[PDB]
Symmetry: C3
């Protein structure tokens, strides 16, 4: 009963080494902390703002690595290339509106610019996928908004099956 | 101008008689109460957690029975088989985000585990479909969150048409 | 860096001249006010509650007129013909859940009948589309709920591309 987590950084800037990935490095620090989630980093990667490459990575981590949780950081704003939510929508099987709601209310409680965030939260197989903002402060804060329900959420999904495996079987 | 309501219990446990359907029996008691909705139970059924059987029942109650309201209870959590929201999404014509929002905020106001609920609310023909949690306390509480707008909501849908009937006509 | 706005009134009543379009005329007054958004009205039109005519108008204003913002007023309730949200869903490329959430919470803060509103907010090319209620008071109030994030939202979309133009190019 260990928690295998994947952190996926979506950003043309970090991908082209124009900037340091402080958000993703910090999330990896937050996910492994015993006082928080106490999980283990089982995957990490920086991809550009391309829906097809985000979708492929997500499917791989869910169907092949069978991670329990994937936190994506970046690509959830209004800027033209921000398509993380759209890629997430094409890969999830079941939507988790309550988690997206939790993070959005928390944000709008902080600033009206909170309505410029477009996160999607969903489930695929035994994996929960959470769209976090690209900034270090925001992804850390949003992660805290949902952290209380993550342990129970993950445990509920532990015995789910990877569809492509059932359909073939 | 009577309110014909259907209560649909989705749960492998109750379907296999492993447990008593306290939530669905209680909702039928809440829906018929004159101080609450004062409706009439026009349909009731216990089905398993199978998206196809939920979808078929829903379509039948809307297109053939033309119920004014359908309250489903169960199958809206994170457990692998909980697919009530997904079945509901495949049958509704128009979504009612405000009602799902109302119930979710009410839940998160009670507990952070409220973000583990994934209800969908929508409209098909003259029928409003509400996804309620499987527990007796939760489905009763969520029902109360929306009850104030149900009378007006139902009246607005009374003169809607059953599409399969217009398309054939 | 000017803000070219379109106001689209959806309503069989106004279309058949059965009623004055106070909501749309007033929104045009709110959008052009220097103390508010200070934009310019670049398009305006009254259409009936027909999903196909709403979709066509929306696509035209986004792909051909390349407006920065479109505020639709009307057709977001439970009445059988209210299909503005459905037409909006068929034309947006990216959804903006936070804005719809902002307006809904603001409404439910005013009245429980706020859960009878079904607005959708989304992005297509460099255009943001906001579904506002048909009443003058509501569309004015909802507009105020989101106004704080509109300037930043619009600026972020200024350099987006009109897909049909890239795909052909």
């Amino acid at each position: 009963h260990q928690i295998r987590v994947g952190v996926l950084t979506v950003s043309d800037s970090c991908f082209r080494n124009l900037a340091e990935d402080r958000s993703g490095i910090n999330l990896k620090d937050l996910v492994q902390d015993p006082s928080l989630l106490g999980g283990t980093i089982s995957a990490y990667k920086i991809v550009p703002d391309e829906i097809e490459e985000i979708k492929e990575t997500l499917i791989d981590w869910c169907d092949e690595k069978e991670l329990n949780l994937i936190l994506t950081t970046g690509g959830t704003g209004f800027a033209p290339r921000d398509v993380t939510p759209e890629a997430t929508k094409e890969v999830i099987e079941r939507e988790a509106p309550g988690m997206a709601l939790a993070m959005l209310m928390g944000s709008l409680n902080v600033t009206p610019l909170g309505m410029l965030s477009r996160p999607v939260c969903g489930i695929r197989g035994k994996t929960l996928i959470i769209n976090l903002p690209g900034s270090k402060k925001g992804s850390q804060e949003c992660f805290q908004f949902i952290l209380p329900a993550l342990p129970h959420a993950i445990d509920l999904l532990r015995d789910a099956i990877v569809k492509v495996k059932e359909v073939h079987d």
